[PDB]
Design a binder for this molecule. Structure first.
Ligand SMILES: Cc1cn([C@H]2C[C@H](OP(=O)(O)O)[C@@H](COP(=O)(O)O)O2)c(=O)[nH]c1=O
Ligand SMILES: [Ca+2]
Length: 135
């Protein structure tokens, strides 16, 4: 896979961020995970929703460098969002959320599953530690 640079435009929520990519603003959705929704229609927030959102917003707004890494299949979803692994100063945001119990490994669609193992191990560790959502 290969990492390419991108620039933060804005964090939307725990798993969705807007970036300027190759000079065009696009919304990206983090591959392989799912954070709790905060703007569920009328609902206004699932437990850990707000928590997942600030974590991601904090990681990306404080980075010196952001990089996106596409997997091997489809690079956009049916909503037109780019599907990638996002790295903030070389730290993968997708894994950081899972490791904290603020996301679960979800939407696993072959062939975009290069880091599925890696993420599954971090989830196991967050479950074995009873963090956030596994609390
Ligand atoms: C991460 C991911 C989500 N999606 C789809 C599945 C879900 O569609 P539906 O809206 O049909 O449920 C939705 C999950 O997105 P959100 O978690 O942002 O809702 O996006 C993909 O199509 N491929 C992906 O890899
Ligand atoms: Ca979500």
């Amino acid at each position: 896979l290969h990492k390419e640079p991108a620039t933060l435009i804005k964090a939307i929520d725990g798993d969705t961020v807007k970036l300027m990519y190759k000079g065009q603003p696009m919304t990206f959705r983090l591959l392989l995970v799912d954070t709790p929704d905060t703007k569920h229609p009328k609902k206004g927030v699932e437990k850990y929703g707000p928590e997942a959102s600030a974590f991601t917003k904090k990681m990306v707004e404080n980075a010196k460098k952001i990089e996106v890494e596409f997997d091997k299949g489809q690079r956009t979803d049916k909503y037109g969002r780019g599907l990638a692994y996002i790295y903030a100063d070389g730290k993968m945001v997708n894994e950081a959320l899972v490791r904290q119990g603020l996301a679960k490994v979800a939407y696993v669609y072959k062939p975009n599953n290069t880091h599925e193992q890696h993420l599954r191990k971090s989830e196991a560790q967050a479950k074995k530690e009873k963090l956030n959502i596994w609390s």
